[PDB]
């Protein structure tokens, strides 16, 4: 998010994340962030849930295009730049960088595809720069009757309203099929107390009892031990070991 190196929505960037922790309390929820939306699940459920892997795509678009980043949407950005299926599940983090990413008469670097021969497939990316068939047959790298070029520039500036400003948008997609959970959002969420009956959890292993220091000698690879008749006798502290 801090890099902001996705000024051009057309030919957007892609990233893959796995075997990590996605703490959303700091992401898309602090004061600097302006807007944050999710589809198919609430932010709290996302934080409390685990995912196999997350794919991240980033792009900067105007105010009129942010509404197009949602399942089953239609529009210039949706049809020619970033199309999504109706069943898509994910989140979009949008922040307005007009103050720190706009010029009085600049911002020509924010390009987007205004036309295309056909709509892009779901999660499809296209870097082709061929002329669009504007009424007449498409030109082969030449000028013709109309032969308009597909791409265009936003040209953000203060003269434009909030709806035409450089919103830096990052969209995440979540995978859950065949999930040996490796991505999760929980914080530390730890608290300890001893010498009194309490319900406890150590990476699961839910139970009740009094926790006291033990003189046993657990091996480095052993997490918890069982007494005779398979009774949980001692457990290793995940944090303090």
């Amino acid at each position, epitope marked *: 998010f801090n*890099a*902001t*190196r*996705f*000024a*051009s929505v057309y*030919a*957007w*960037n892609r990233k893959r994340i796995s075997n990590c922790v996605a703490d959303y309390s700091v992401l898309y929820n602090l004061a600097p962030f302006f807007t944050f939306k999710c589809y198919g699940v609430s932010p709290t459920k996302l934080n409390d849930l685990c995912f196999t892997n997350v794919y991240a795509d980033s792009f900067v678009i105007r105010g009129d295009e942010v509404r197009q980043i949602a399942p089953g949407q239609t529009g210039n950005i949706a049809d020619y730049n970033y199309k999504l299926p109706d069943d898509f599940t994910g989140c979009v983090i949008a922040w307005n960088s007009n103050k*720190l990413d706009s*010029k009085v008469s*600049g911002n*020509y*670097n924010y*390009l987007y595809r205004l036309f295309r021969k056909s709509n892009l497939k779901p999660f499809e990316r296209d*870097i082709s*720069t*061929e*002329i669009y068939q504007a009424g007449n047959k498409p030109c082969n*790298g*030449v*000028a013709g009757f109309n032969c308009y*070029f597909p*791409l265009r520039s936003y040209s953000f500036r203060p003269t434009y309203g909030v709806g035409h400003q450089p919103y830096r948008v990052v969209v995440l997609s979540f995978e859950l099929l065949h999930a040996p959970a490796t991505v999760c959002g929980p914080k530390k969420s730890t608290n300890l107390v001893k010498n009194k009956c309490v319900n406890f959890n150590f990476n699961g292993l839910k139970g009740t009892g009094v926790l006291t220091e033990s003189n046993k000698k657990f091996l480095p690879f052993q997490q918890f031990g069982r007494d005779i008749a398979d009774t949980t006798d001692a457990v290793r502290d995940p944090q303090t070991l």
Partner: antibody, heavy 123, light 108 residues
Framework: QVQLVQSGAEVKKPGSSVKVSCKASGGTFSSYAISWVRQAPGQGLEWMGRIIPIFGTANYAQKFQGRVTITADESTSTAYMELSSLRSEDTAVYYC????????????????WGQGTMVTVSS | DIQMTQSPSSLSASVGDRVTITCRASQGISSWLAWYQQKPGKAPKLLIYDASNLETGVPSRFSGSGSGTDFTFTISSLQPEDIATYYCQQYDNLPLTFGGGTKVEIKR
């Protein structure tokens, strides 16, 4: 690969116009935007203007608007620039560059250079 | 227009010595700053284009970082082949401006 070919040095009297060329080869000509730069004999570089032949539009710097025109032709994949009302100080090294930073998620920076053309204005 | 200042004007250090340079801008920025290598009378060679972002072919020798109004660049060590002037660029806006340039030379 991608390369640019420029013309040789040309000298013309003050007050008239000078013609320059820079041919492009490799890949698809429609995927390259040509930007023009100038370098004097010791002073820093100077930017004249930039054109995108596939667009059909062009832009020029405020300091050099009007006196500078840029044209390019797809058939022979060459880009051209027009300068009018030349002056003695115009003697400088002129380069042609490809503003490729418009397609692959890469913005407003050049990657390719020509050979350079030497132009001198004197009586 | 945007004006930038490069200091110090020149550097002097022997082969195998650390060298660093800083570039400053009229207003605070967080991206769109490049560094150029220009030999005497030769076209500049790209070194850095985006903040702490090297292009293809750049060695691990050269690194850059910075934020706000001022940005800094460092050279871990020197060899005779890279004796030339370094320049700073800002292109967040079309009216491109280039720094005054700084020279690094062998010390003996």
């Amino acid at each position: 690969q991608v390369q640019l070919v420029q013309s040789g040095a040309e000298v013309k009297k003050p007050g008239s116009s000078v013609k320059v060329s820079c041919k492009a080869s490799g890949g698809t000509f429609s995927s390259y935007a040509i930007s023009w730069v100038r370098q004097a004999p010791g002073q820093g570089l100077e930017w004249m203007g930039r054109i995108i032949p596939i667009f059909g539009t062009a832009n020029y710097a405020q300091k050099f608007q009007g006196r500078v025109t840029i044209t390019a032709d797809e058939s022979t994949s060459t880009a051209y620039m027009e300068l009018s009302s030349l002056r003695s100080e115009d003697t400088a090294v002129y380069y042609c560059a490809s503003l490729a930073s418009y397609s692959s998620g890469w913005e407003d920076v050049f990657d390719i250079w020509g050979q350079g053309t030497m132009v001198t204005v004197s009586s | 227009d945007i004006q930038m200042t490069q200091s110090p004007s020149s550097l002097s250090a022997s082969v195998g010595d650390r060298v660093t340079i800083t570039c400053r801008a009229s207003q605070g920025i967080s991206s769109w700053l490049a560094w150029y290598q220009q030999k005497p009378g030769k076209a500049p060679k790209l070194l850095i284009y985006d903040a702490s972002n090297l292009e293809t072919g750049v060695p691990s020798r050269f690194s850059g970082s910075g934020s706000g109004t001022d940005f800094t660049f460092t050279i871990s060590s020197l060899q005779p082949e890279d004796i030339a002037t370094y320049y700073c660029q800002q292109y967040d806006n079309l009216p491109l401006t280039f720094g005054g340039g700084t020279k690094v030379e062998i010390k003996r």
